[PDB]
From a paper:
Like MhFbpA and Thermus thermophilus [name] (TtFbpA), McFbpA adopts a typical fold of class III periplasmic iron binding protein with the two globular lobes. Each of the lobes consists of α helices surrounding a twisted mixed β sheet in the center. These two lobes are connected by a pair of antiparallel β strands (Phe96-Phe106 and Gly222-Val234), which acts as a hinge allowing for the adoption of either the open or closed conformation. Isogenic mutants of [name] and AfeA were constructed, demonstrating that [name] is essential for the utilization of human Tf and Lf as iron sources and that AfeA does not take up iron from these iron sources.
Two crystallization conditions were identified within 1 week after setup, producing the apo (colourless) and the holo (red–orange) crystal forms. Our structural studies yielded the structure of [name] [name] in two different forms: an apo open form and an iron-holo open form. Two high resolution crystal structures of the [name] [name] were solved in the iron-holo open and apo open conformations, revealing more details about the mechanism behind [name]-mediated iron transport. The process of how iron is bound in a class III [name] has been proposed in studies with T. thermophilus [name] (TtFbpA). The proposed mechanism of iron binding with insights from both the previous study and the current study is illustrated in Fig. 7. The synergistic anion (e.g., carbonate) binds to the open [name] through the arginine residues in N terminal lobe (Step 1). The ferric ion then binds to the three tyrosines in the C terminal lobe (Step 2) which results in the [name] adopting a closed conformation through bidentate binding of iron by the carbonate anion (Step 3).
Residue numbers in the entry: 1 to 312
Write the structure that this text describes.
């Protein structure tokens, strides 16, 4: 048999996964790779005559939008409910987180003592004026972070925080997270907010970056560090729904979690799978247990909040 995977991940990430599943089961896995937005738009327009069987995409915001657009079908999977924590999967069973990333604080340890750091909100303290850098608001990772901030602390408080962030910028918001981390390394930025896997990716490419850039897990005294996922669900109009389901269930297993999360310097979604050592070295941390689908429910609120605060 054969299944088709629509994937918002990099093609090189899914290539060994498709091959390893084909070797284990004999099923041919065809990967169709595109940006999350255009991919979901294609899946919606193909309708009942779609070739896709599985959707893999990034960020609870995009998974929520795929669910709202009606392109996924809910599945009752005993295996996925056991292997994936409830806060990392759709409450109505449309999709399942398969890798975990944290969006958290980074700092230059030659210029900032970690005792100076605590929460996302404290980055709006005037002591950070001219020292903070951020990635652009026009990005799902920042929409999701701000979306959970609104859920955890309210709209008024979040408006004040994000407005304080912008007042404290040392530079205009960067186009991507990696540019932001490299600007901390360059000395332009003393503190910033980005996804952990880019830091692992950057240290892998340039280990000396560690001299000027360190990770700090935010909000440990409160609800925990913001986390998000990449995830997968069975497409509503799949022609092989049972085989599509057995692929996602396998992705949640020990062997596939290594291939899927570790290779991109992300955390496994399955808590019985220990993080790769490059990632685990950063240390243990309390993560937020809010259901990451809130990243989508509050996405429009977040977009309006960042626009209102002048967060470009
Ligand atoms: Na602090
Ligand atoms: Na401020
Ligand atoms: Na929470």
């Amino acid at each position: 048999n054969e299944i088709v995977v629509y994937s918002a991940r990099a093609d090189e990430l899914l290539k060994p996964i498709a091959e390893a599943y084909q070797q284990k089961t004999g099923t041919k896995v065809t990967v169709v790779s595109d940006k999350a937005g255009p991919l979901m738009e294609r899946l919606k327009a193909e309708g009942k005559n779609t070739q896709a069987d599985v959707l893999i995409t990034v960020d609870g915001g995009n998974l929520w939008q795929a669910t709202q657009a009606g392109v996924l079908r809910p599945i009752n999977s005993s295996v996925l409910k056991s292997n994936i924590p409830s806060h990392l999967r759709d409450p109505k069973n449309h999709w399942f987180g398969l890798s975990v990333r944290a969006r958290t604080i980074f700092y230059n340890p030659n210029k900032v003592n970690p005792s100076e750091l605590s929460t996302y909100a404290d980055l709006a303290d005037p002591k950070w004026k001219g020292r903070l850098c951020l990635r652009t608001s026009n990005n799902v990772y920042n929409q999701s972070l701000v979306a959970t901030m609104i859920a955890n602390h309210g709209q008024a408080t979040t408006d004040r925080v994000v407005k304080g962030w912008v007042a404290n910028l040392a530079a205009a918001p960067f186009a991507n997270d990696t540019a932001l981390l490299e600007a901390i390394d360059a000395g332009r930025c003393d503190v910033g907010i980005a996804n952990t896997y880019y830091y692992g990716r950057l240290l892998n490419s340039k280990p000396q970056v560690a001299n000027n850039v360190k990770v700090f897990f935010a909000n440990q005294a409160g609800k925990g560090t913001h986390v998000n996922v990449s995830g997968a669900g069975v497409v509503k109009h799949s022609d092989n729904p049972a085989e599509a389901q057995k692929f996602i269930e396998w992705l949640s297993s020990n062997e596939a979690q290594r291939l899927y999360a570790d290779r991109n310097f992300e955390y496994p979604a399955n808590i019985q799978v220990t993080p790769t050592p490059a990632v685990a070295r950063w240390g243990r941390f309390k993560q937020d247990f809010i259901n990451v689908s809130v990243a989508g429910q509050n996405q429009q609120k977040a977009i309006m909040t960042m626009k209102r605060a002048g967060y470009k």
